[PDB]
From TrEMBL, chain B:
Family in the record: Belongs to the TUBGCP family.
Described function: Component of the gamma-tubulin ring complex (gTuRC) which mediates microtubule nucleation. The gTuRC regulates the minus-end nucleation of alpha-beta tubulin heterodimers that grow into microtubule protafilaments, a critical step in centrosome duplication and spindle formation.
Section of the entire sequence shown: 311 to 500 of 1698
Gene, per the UniProt record: tubgcp6.L
Native species: Xenopus laevis (African clawed frog)
Subunit structure: Component of the gamma-tubulin ring complex (gTuRC) consisting of TUBGCP2, TUBGCP3, TUBGCP4, TUBGCP5 and TUBGCP6 and gamma-tubulin TUBG1 or TUBG2. TUBGCP2, TUBGCP3, TUBGCP4, TUBGCP5 and TUBGCP6 assemble in a 5:5:2:1:1 stoichiometry; each is associated with a gamma-tubulin, thereby arranging 14 gamma-tubulins in a helical manner. Gamma-tubulin at the first position is blocked by TUBGCP3 at the last position, allowing 13 protafilaments to grow into a microtubule.
Locations listed in the record: Cytoplasm, Cytoskeleton, Microtubule organizing center, Centrosome
Name recorded for this polypeptide: Gamma-tubulin complex component 6
Automatic annotation (TrEMBL), chain D:
Function field: Component of the gamma-tubulin ring complex (gTuRC) which mediates microtubule nucleation. The gTuRC regulates the minus-end nucleation of alpha-beta tubulin heterodimers that grow into microtubule protafilaments, a critical step in centrosome duplication and spindle formation.
Family the entry assigns: Belongs to the TUBGCP family.
Signal peptide: none
Protein name according to UniProt: Gamma-tubulin complex component
Subcellular location: Cytoplasm, Cytoskeleton, Microtubule organizing center, Centrosome
Organism per entry: Xenopus laevis
The Gamma tubulin complex component protein N-terminal domain, residue ranges: 61-302
TrEMBL record, chain E:
Subcellular location: Cytoplasm, Cytoskeleton, Microtubule organizing center, Centrosome
SUBUNIT field: Interacts with FAM29A. Interacts with HSPA1A and HSPA1B. Interacts with gamma-tubulin in a HSPA1A/B-dependent manner.
Top-level taxon in the UniProt lineage: Eukaryota
Protein name from the UniProt record: Protein NEDD1
From-to range in the entire protein, with total length: 597 to 620 of 671
Transmembrane segment boundaries: none
Organism, as annotated: Xenopus laevis
Automatic annotation (TrEMBL), chain F:
Function per UniProt: Component of the gamma-tubulin ring complex (gTuRC) which mediates microtubule nucleation. The gTuRC regulates the minus-end nucleation of alpha-beta tubulin heterodimers that grow into microtubule protafilaments, a critical step in centrosome duplication and spindle formation.
Family, per entry: Belongs to the TUBGCP family.
Location of the protein in the cell: Cytoplasm, Cytoskeleton, Microtubule organizing center, Centrosome
Name of the protein in its database record: Gamma-tubulin complex component
Protein encoded by which gene: tubgcp4.L
Section covered of the full-length record: 1 to 347 of 666
Domain Gamma tubulin complex component protein N-terminal: residue ranges: 2-287
Domain of life per record: Eukaryota
Subunit-structure text: Component of the gamma-tubulin ring complex (gTuRC) consisting of TUBGCP2, TUBGCP3, TUBGCP4, TUBGCP5 and TUBGCP6 and gamma-tubulin TUBG1 or TUBG2. TUBGCP2, TUBGCP3, TUBGCP4, TUBGCP5 and TUBGCP6 assemble in a 5:5:2:1:1 stoichiometry; each is associated with a gamma-tubulin, thereby arranging 14 gamma-tubulins in a helical manner. Gamma-tubulin at the first position is blocked by TUBGCP3 at the last position, allowing 13 protafilaments to grow into a microtubule.
């Protein structure tokens, strides 16, 4: 299976470093946050998101790694299992770190 | 499978009430317009009545214009709401120029009026033969089971009656 | 009744182009409330919660 | 309340989501999609459950009825007016989503042609007469469509997606051999001179197509009849210019193009000027008739009705059983129809 | 004109970064 | 599985039915919720829907060598699939009557078609791998019904009859006033006064002898030479004989055959070579 | 819906069949319970009610620019409306017979008047824009009848 509820619990269990039933209290809190709406800063054009990731690479002084990222992007496009590539890409962009 | 089209005319009537309802709010004074009965049969008996100088419930004689007046507000026209309301006005106008022609025949008298032509009175003796004839066509208009057989017939007549009435209602008389 | 209907019809032309995505009936209510004084910002917000609530419900 | 009344007496909405939704039936093989979805969701770790517009089983055949002749469809996406395709969210519960896509993609591409052929309808003479012959087939093709519409409203329903689908197949195969004719028909718009070659060569592509189908016919002679309708009504102004060029002496032409490059000499030192165009033996008959009428209207001294009748008389006794083989024989009755008028016109020339 | 453009592009990027900063 | 198998057999793929496009033979999936036995029988009912879409692809291909007997044979071939498509829709109502029918019922019913479809796959294959055209399409179909099996022998003489009608129009127009129809040059009468006519021995059947071919040649050449000269001297007439109407009626009578009659074809090669042949004989007498 | 549509096409407005003097008689956009597809074919029927009230004003304006072949041209224009109004009435008795009908049936019956009506609407606008009257009226209709389309 893979219902939303079952997947959100597994995520919480490993990241908090505590058991399944011992991450519950945070588990409820997690459901409110996801069920409260937000809207991304970039809403239109798949390209607008990609160029952002690409700008980020330069900023971090990692020009070479952004070239490698373009190459990976083609790979993702060709396999076609995912139909909301953008969500995945915006999400890693946000969780970027040094 | 039933759609709005396939369901019927009655479905359209329910919907028409609903569609209206949004607009009725601002035409509202403190309450919105309400529906008023006429049946399908009440219209086909009325259509013959305006065309002989008589009122029915739909038709209100107005004596400050010598014209007929239909109910100005929403009348539900069986299952055909407010389209007939506009259709019933063109044939209402056709019977009006008939009551203006009939009013005009009476005017002329030679009791002591001698500026009312002799010729002008002979004009009326031929005019009244034209008025009984109309009545005999309305007596043969039956049967009326749609408003259409009555309106399309008087596409010819409706234009005719405007000429024939409003040449004189100006006032030429005598040798003129 | 004549005046009112004729603004709405012009109003429905704009709504379908601008991509409001609302229904006819609902728009008439939006307009009546404005003429009686409402804030526009609040009114769009309410519409939005109701809209999202309907989609989720049906599925 | 009125809203609730409508909602029960009309089938529940599926162009806007604000009506609750069925996709239930008591048979075990009709809830196939709910079973198929479930399978995908557990087998594939990476499954993307689509947001699907729940349809409203075997009402997809009503949208096939409209689409094949009638109006633009705003329930399905059409990228343009020559590209009809079917949205990727339509499910019927007694098939898979994919399986469904595949029957609706056959009729989409068959409604792509009738919808394209409808944009040619303009509510010169040759094109106006080709338009009224294409438009005539459209009002006789909806007779079968309006029949199938009364079948679904009848209770019990009967129809499914695919059961009246092999019933509308003669018309289906008739609208495809229209496509091969029309691609070859108009596809002379980029070509230089729009004047006589477009009009001539679309009468000529009709002429080329009746050999390709009639002489391999007699197993679909349904397609032989159609291409001949399109020809008898397309040839109808183009013969009657030749009728006016004899019995009146001079003819009618547009004031912005020629349809046959028939031209008369205003000074007298030659009769008529000719310029070649696109049948070929019939063109010589026009030269000799106009020479002789052009003198006789400046100096007196000293066809369509007939075509239809010679066609009919083969028919009451396309294929025929008074002619072999086949359509060029009914045509060679027309070459005597010009001929009986043509030789006695030229009779009168030498008389002056 | 060439210089006018370089400054314009520059404006365009900062108000994009400032926008992502406001959102956060 | 039932409604996705009814329409995949009609030539409309599923995606529990996966169309691998005339390479290999994996045409249904492995299905967890049916038994291990039930996914094995499913592939067998699908090979008879794979050879069915090998037939609907061959019609469009030869409805654009690419001769006109290739194409008479295609519109022959669509009428063998007419009881096939009719038995699939007769099966639709059988599965609505009760939902207690599964794909073992479908096996029983769809084996009147496993005695027809592989055997016609071989007809269409020898066609596309030799690139055959002309009257030697009829000669392929004739040598394939030289094989056994009672379903394949009734069917391929019906597919033979539709395209022997395509010959009947040629050879009647050939012996009228001397019309020669060639849209690609397919018929045995070759062209390339009286003009030139010749015969190809390389597009001629084995059920038409050499000695039978030359009854059609000599008659057809006689009518042709009056098409140049004068048609009031026409042996077959046109104004002065209504023998051409007798010839039409005779042709139509024989146009169809229940299978293929050899004796009826050659009986009217006698008749067209006599009766009307008493007209030009009394010219050359006196000449 | 079906019978009430017949009154829209003999020139009588509901508030559903709204008359606009710009774009004509038109069906009001996305009204409750009207299929996307049925509004599209109902709009092709409303163009035959738009040119029909653009034709009945052209009679009444000039009967009962000036001219005496203009009003002979008006009794020229009333004769093409003659089969139209009979085919509205042959829909009328069918929809009194039973109330379940498809709008495809009116689509089928009144396409015939969708190729007479555009081709005559250019005639009356051409009369009113070159300002022509008289015996050149007889010339104006004659050379169009030389033109395509048997109807």
């Amino acid at each position: 299976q893979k219902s939303p509820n079952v997947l959100l619990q597994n995520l919480c269990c490993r990241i908090l470093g505590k058991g399944e039933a011992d991450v519950a209290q945070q588990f409820q809190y997690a459901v409110r946050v996801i069920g409260s709406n937000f809207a991304p800063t970039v809403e239109r054009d798949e390209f607008l998101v990609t160029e952002k990731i690409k700008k980020e690479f330069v900023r971090q002084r990692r020009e070479a790694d952004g070239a490698l990222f373009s190459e990976l992007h083609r790979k993702l496009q060709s396999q076609g299992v995912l139909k909301n590539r953008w969500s995945i890409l915006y999400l890693l962009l946000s969780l970027s770190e040094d | 499978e039933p759609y709005v089209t396939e369901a019927g005319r009655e479905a359209f009537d329910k919907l028409y009430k609903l569609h209206e309802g949004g607009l009725q709010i601002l035409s509202a004074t403190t309450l919105q317009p309400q529906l008023v009965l006429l049946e399908e049969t009440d219209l086909v008996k009325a259509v013959l009545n305006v065309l002989i100088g008589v009122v029915s419930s739909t038709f209100s004689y107005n004596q400050a214009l010598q014209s007929f007046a239909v109910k100005q507000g929403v009348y539900i026209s069986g299952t055909s709401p407010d389209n007939v309301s506009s259709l019933l006005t063109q044939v209402a106008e056709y019977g009006t120029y008939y009551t203006r022609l009939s009013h005009f025949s009476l005017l002329t008298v030679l009791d002591s009026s001698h500026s009312n032509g002799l010729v002008f009175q002979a004009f009326t003796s031929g005019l009244r033969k034209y008025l009984q004839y109309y009545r005999a066509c309305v007596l043969s208009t039956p049967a009326s089971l749609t408003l259409l057989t009555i309106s399309f017939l008087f596409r010819k007549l409706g234009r005719q009656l405007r000429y024939l009435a409003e040449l004189c209602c100006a006032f030429p008389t005598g040798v003129k | 009744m004549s005046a009112v209907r004729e603004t709405m019809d012009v109003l429905l032309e704009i709504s379908r182009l601008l991509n409001t995505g609302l229904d006819m009936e609902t728009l008439s209510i939006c307009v009546r409330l404005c003429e009686q004084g409402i804030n526009p910002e609040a009114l769009s917000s309410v519409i939005k919660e109701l809209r999202r609530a309907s989609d989720t419900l049906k599925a | 309340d009125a809203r609730s009344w409508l909602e029960q007496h009309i089938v529940h909405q599926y162009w806007t989501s604000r009506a609750p939704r069925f996709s239930h039936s008591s048979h075990l093989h009709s809830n196939l999609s709910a079973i198929w979805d479930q399978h995908l969701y557990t087998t594939d770790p990476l499954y993307t459950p689509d947001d699907k517009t729940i349809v409203t089983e075997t009402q997809v055949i009503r949208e096939t009825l409209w689409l094949l002749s009638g109006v633009k469809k705003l329930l399905i996406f059409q990228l343009n007016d020559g590209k009809v395709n079917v949205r990727n969210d339509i499910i019927v519960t007694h098939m898979t989503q994919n399986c469904l896509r595949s029957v609706l993609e056959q009729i989409a591409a068959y409604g792509q042609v009738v919808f394209r052929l409808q944009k040619f309808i303009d509510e010169f003479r040759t094109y106006q007469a080709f338009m009224w012959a294409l438009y005539k087939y459209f009002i006789s093709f909806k007779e079968e469509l309006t029949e199938i519409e009364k079948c679904i409203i009848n209770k019990d329903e009967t129809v499914t997606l695919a059961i009246v689908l092999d019933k509308l197949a003669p018309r289906l195969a008739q609208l495809k051999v229209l496509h091969r004719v029309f691609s070859t028909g108009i596809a002379e718009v980029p070509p230089d001179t729009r004047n006589v070659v477009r009009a001539s060569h679309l009468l000529n592509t009709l002429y080329k197509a009746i050999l390709d189908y009639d002489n391999v016919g007699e197993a679909s002679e349904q397609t032989v009849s159609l291409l001949f309708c399109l020809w008898v009504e397309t040839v109808r102004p183009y013969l009657e210019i030749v009728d006016e060029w004899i019995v009146h002496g001079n003819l009618f032409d547009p004031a912005k193009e020629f349809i046959i490059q028939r031209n008369k000499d205003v000074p007298f030192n030659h009769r008529d000027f000719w310029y070649a165009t696109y049948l070929k033996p019939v063109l010589k008959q026009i030269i000799m008739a106009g020479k002789s009428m052009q003198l006789l209207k400046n100096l007196k001294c000293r066809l369509y009705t007939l075509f239809l009748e010679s066609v009919q008389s083969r028919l009451q006794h396309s294929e025929s059983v008074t002619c072999q083989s086949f359509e060029l024989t009914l045509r060679s009755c027309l070459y005597p129809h010009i001929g009986k008028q043509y030789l006695e016109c030229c009779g009168n020339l030498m008389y002056t | 004109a060439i210089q006018i453009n370089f400054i314009k592009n520059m404006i365009e990027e900062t108000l994009d970064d400032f926008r992502e900063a406001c959102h956060r | 599985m039932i409604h996705e198998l009814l329409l995949a057999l009609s030539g409309y793929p599923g995606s529990i039915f996966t169309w691998n496009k005339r390479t290999g033979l994996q045409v249904s999936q492995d299905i967890p919720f049916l038994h291990p036995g039930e996914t094995s029988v499913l592939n067998r009912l699908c090979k008879l829907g794979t050879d069915y879409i090998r037939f609907t692809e061959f019609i469009e291909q030869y409805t654009g060598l690419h001769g006109i007997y290739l194409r008479a044979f295609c519109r022959g071939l669509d009428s063998i699939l007419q009881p096939y498509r009719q038995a699939l829709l007769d099966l639709e109502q059988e599965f609505l009557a009760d939902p207690h029918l599964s794909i073992s019922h479908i096996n029983y019913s769809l084996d009147q078609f496993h005695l027809l479809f592989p055997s016609i796959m071989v007809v269409v294959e020898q066609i596309k791998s030799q690139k055959i055209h002309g009257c030697q399409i009829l000669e392929t179909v004739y040598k394939h019904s030289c094989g056994g099996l009672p379903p394949v022998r009734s069917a391929l003489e019906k597919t033979l009859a539709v395209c022997h009608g395509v010959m009947y129009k040629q050879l009647s127009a050939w012996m009228l006033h001397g019309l020669l129809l060639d849209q690609y040059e397919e018929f045995f009468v070759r062209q390339g006064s009286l003009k030139q006519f010749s015969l190809r021995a390389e597009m001629l059947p084995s059920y038409i002898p050499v000695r039978v071919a030359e009854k059609i040649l000599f008659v057809g050449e006689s009518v042709q030479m009056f098409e140049n000269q004068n048609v009031n001297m026409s042996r077959t007439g046109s104004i002065l004989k209504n023998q051409e109407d007798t010839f039409a009626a005779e042709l139509h009578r024989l146009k169809q055959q229940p299978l293929f009659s050899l004796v009826d074809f050659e009986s009217v090669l006698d008749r067209i070579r006599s009766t009307v042949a008493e007209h030009l004989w009394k010219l050359m007498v006196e000449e």
